[PDB]
Design a protein around this ligand. Sequence first.
Ligand SMILES: *[C@@H]1O[C@H](CO)[C@@H](O[C@@H]2O[C@H](CO)[C@@H](O[C@@H]3O[C@H](CO[C@H]4O[C@H](CO)[C@@H](O)[C@H](O)[C@@H]4O[C@@H]4O[C@H](CO)[C@@H](O[C@@H]5O[C@H](CO)[C@H](O)[C@H](O)[C@H]5O)[C@H](O)[C@H]4NC(C)=O)[C@@H](O)[C@H](O[C@H]4O[C@H](CO)[C@@H](O)[C@H](O)[C@@H]4O[C@@H]4O[C@H](CO)[C@@H](O[C@@H]5O[C@H](CO)[C@H](O)[C@H](O)[C@H]5O)[C@H](O)[C@H]4NC(C)=O)[C@@H]3O)[C@H](O)[C@H]2NC(C)=O)[C@H](O)[C@H]1NC(C)=O
Ligand SMILES: Nc1ccn([C@@H]2O[C@H](CO)[C@@H](O)[C@H]2O)c(=O)n1
Length: 318
Amino acid sequence: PEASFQVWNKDSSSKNLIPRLQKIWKNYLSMNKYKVSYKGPGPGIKFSAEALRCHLRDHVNVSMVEVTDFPFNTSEWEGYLPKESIRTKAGPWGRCAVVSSAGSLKSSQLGREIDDHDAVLRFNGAPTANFQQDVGTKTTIRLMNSQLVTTEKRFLKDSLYNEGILIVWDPSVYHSDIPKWYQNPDYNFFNNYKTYRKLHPNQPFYILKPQMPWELWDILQEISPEEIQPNPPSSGMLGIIIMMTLCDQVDIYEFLPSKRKTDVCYYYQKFFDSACTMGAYHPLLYEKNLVKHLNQGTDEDIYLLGKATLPGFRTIHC
Ligand SMILES: *[C@@H]1O[C@H](CO)[C@@H](O[C@@H]2O[C@H](CO)[C@@H](O[C@@H]3O[C@H](CO[C@H]4O[C@H](CO)[C@@H](O)[C@H](O)[C@@H]4O[C@@H]4O[C@H](CO)[C@@H](O[C@@H]5O[C@H](CO)[C@H](O)[C@H](O)[C@H]5O)[C@H](O)[C@H]4NC(C)=O)[C@@H](O)[C@H](O[C@H]4O[C@H](CO)[C@@H](O)[C@H](O)[C@@H]4O[C@@H]4O[C@H](CO)[C@@H](O[C@@H]5O[C@H](CO)[C@H](O)[C@H](O)[C@H]5O)[C@H](O)[C@H]4NC(C)=O)[C@@H]3O)[C@H](O)[C@H]2NC(C)=O)[C@H](O)[C@H]1NC(C)=O
Ligand SMILES: Nc1ccn([C@@H]2O[C@H](CO)[C@@H](O)[C@H]2O)c(=O)n1
């Protein structure tokens, strides 16, 4: 007979959520922090995985702030941004993994498998020490939010960040261009970005353009059958899109949860929070519908391995 088990439900909505997280979702809708007014095609639209993958390649500009973008062409910013394009510095690569920071990675024994990709993406302060056998040992790209660069004093100190290519991103006002964003960043990380840059001139450190997270959000809101949190996508979703721009194959682990689904928010932290898996601030719930929708793997691969497989943009149709 055929096995019965549960993997992520592609049509997850707020009505599936715990009432606790339902109120939180509702409240973020209300305090429209980023002054979002969705004016696109309208809540709820169906795409084939082939078409949506191609609607994603075409309508999201994965690009980094360059020294041509005002005011990063001014004297104070001289020599601060990387000379070369990230695409020059990064691959293009063949096998790539995205390591989510979920607690569900604990005792998953993915460490060797994750190490067998040409390049590995991790987030924020997710550490390697003590976790090699569950998480891997290699860090090629690390995507971080601006809050960590602004406020985490460990960012300028801990030897871990000093591995691979770094990227910082910052939530802007909805549809804001670079100069408006620069004047009003969510966190003021510019000082610390500069200060790091002085410390490690050799290691490539990029700033994501503020437009990218909202371009991805538009598609989310357009897909979902209801209003999603008007806050940018999680680092995890942006990281998926990024690696898709740089890889043929992206294997993404414990984003879609395995059977090890747990309230433990992070593998390196000890505190419990269901919201880390299901979403509170980020529209994480709808991102996972998406990743589950584009998933080219089996449902068994999700149950056992927490593994989704999405193909990279380089290998797509029309
Ligand atoms: C992600 O990031 C993406 C990249 O940044 C981004 O994509 C960009 O989107 C923009 C839209 O938002 C889009 O902007 C348009 O740009 C047009 C010009 O582009 C050309 O120059 C830019 C320079 O930046 C370049 O990037 C682009 O590629 C174009 O270069 C051309 O490249 C061709 C390559 O294919 C090349 O052709 C090749 O040549 C080869 C030679 O061997 C070979 O032959 C190849 O086979 C051949 O293909 C070509 O030579 C070259 N051309 C040039 C000039 O360099 C603009 O035209 C356009 O502006 C118009 O539209 C906007 C609205 O969109 C209007 O506001 C604006 O006013 C313009 O409207 C025109 O207005 C004039 C004047 O009023 C009108 O003229 C009248 O016409 C009448 C009838 O004709 C009559 O004559 C009257 O007398 C005239 O007065 C005209 O009709 C109006 N047009 C229209 C349609 O109404 C616009 O700015 C940009 O191109 C995109 N970039 C890329 C790379 O795709 C993307 O948006 C980002 N994603 C997200 C989600 O944000
Ligand atoms: N329990 C968790 C914790 C985190 N995450 C994903 O991992 C990224 C890094 O924090 C987050 O941005 C999020 O995408 C997750 O899916 N589940």
